[model samples]
Target: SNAADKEKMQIGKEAPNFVVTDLEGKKIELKDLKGKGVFLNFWGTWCKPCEKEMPYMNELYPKYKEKGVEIIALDADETDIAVKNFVNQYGLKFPVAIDKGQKIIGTYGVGPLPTSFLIDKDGKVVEQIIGEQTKEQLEGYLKKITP
Candidate 1:
C-alpha cells in the first residue's frame, strides 16, 4: 500500500490507512480494523519516556480489548531485535508492529516519542495525544472512544 503521506493527521478525520506487520507476523491494515476502535501508540525503543508508558499501556490493554478497543503499539525507530526484546521485557500482550524501512512514521506525522491516536469504530480519529500517558489517562481515553 502507498504510504498515506497525502493525508494529514487531524481530529475527526479518517485515519490514514496503512499496512503493517505485527511481531506475530499478522498483517494489519487500518482499514481492516473498521468495526472496532483502535488505540495507536507510536513509540521508539530508546525513548525513556516511551518506556514509562509501555507498562501502563500493557496494563490497560486487556480491559480495553475486551471492551472492543484494540491497542496497537507502533515501533518507531528500532530494529526487529530491539523491538522484540522491549516487548518481551515489558510483557506487552497487545499487537506491536515494527515500522520497517521507516515508512509508517511519515504517514502518521509522528514527531514526538509517544504520540497516540484514539480512533473510533467508523475508522475516524476521535483524538490525538502527544507525549506519554498515565494509566488512568489511558483508560479514560479508551473509554471515551470505546465501541
Candidate 2:
C-alpha cells in the first residue's frame, strides 16, 4: 500500500476509469463496462489465492452470463504469456485482461492478490473482498447486484 490514504472506494462511489488489455490484446476499459454489473478482480499469475479463486469465478460467469454480469479478471503487471498460461491452466472462460503497467491496480488500490470489487449496473462499487472467496460468498454478492 502507498503512503496515500488506503481507504477503498465505497458502495456508492463510482469505479475509477482505467484501460487495460485482454489476453488477446483488445483494450478493456472500466468505463466501457458501465450499465453492466461487473466483478472486477485484480489478480496475478503467481498469486496462490488468486489461482484458488479462478475456478469459482469460472463457474459463476456462465451462471450470470444471461443477466449481463461481466467478470474482468485483470492480471497485474504480468506478461501475456504468463497470464495466458494461467488462464488456460484454470480453464477460465471469463473476460481475462492484463494490467501490464499496473495502472489499473493503482487506481483500484489493490493491496493484495484476488481482491475483488463488485460493481453494480450503474458502475458503483457495491462490495469488495480482500481474499480468496468461495463460490457461495461470491454468489451472495452476485445475488445482491443482479437485476
Candidate 3:
C-alpha cells in the first residue's frame, strides 16, 4: 500500500526533481534528464517481481536509447552489494542507481516495488506502471511518450 504521507505525482505534471547517487556514487538529477524521455523505475534488488521485469527493461533500453529514451533503474532500500550482484547477474546495460535512503521513493510515492514512471521530454510524467510488466506492455507505454 502507498503511504499517504508520500506525494502522488500526477501525469502531465513536472516530475519532482531529485538527486540520488548511482551505483558509482555519481549524483544524478531528474532535472538533468530533461529534454528526453526518462523511465524512472523504483525497484529493489530482492523483489521477485522487480527481478522478473528488469531484463526486458535492459533489452529495451539500448534499443530506444538512440531514440531519446533513457531508463534509470532506481534501487530503493537496497544495499550496493545486492544491487551490484543483481546487475551483474542480469547483464543490465543501463544506469542502475542505488537509493539506499529511499528519499526518491518518498518523493515519488513509490510504495511498491517495480513501480515505473515514464517522464516525457518536457519532464512531465506521462505514464506510470505499478507492477511487473512485459516488454510489449512496456513498449506500449513507451510509444505513447516517445517522439
Clashes of each: 0, 0, 0
Candidate 2 lDDT tens digits, 1-147 = 653234346568988767776776778887888777888899887888888878888898898867888888888878777878888888898889877667677767788788988888888987888998888988877777775
* Candidate 3, residue 137: how far the Cα is off, in Å: 0.6
Clashes of 3: 0
TM per model?
A: 0.94, 0.88, 0.89
Q: Which stretches of candidate 1 lie over 4 Å from their true place?
A: 1-5
Better of 2 and 3 by TM-score: 3
Q: Could you tell me the lDDT of residue 33 within candidate 2?
A: 81
Worst 10 residues of 2 by lDDT: 1-10
Per-residue alpha-carbon lDDT of candidate 1 for residues 1-147, written as tens digits (9 for 90 to 100): 543446676789888887888999999999899989999888988988889988988888888898889988899858889889989988989999988766667877788878899999999988989987788989999998788
* TM-score of candidate 3 on Cα atoms, chains taken together: 0.89
By the TM-score metric, which is better: model 1 or model 2? 1
* Clashing residue pairs found in predicted model 3: none
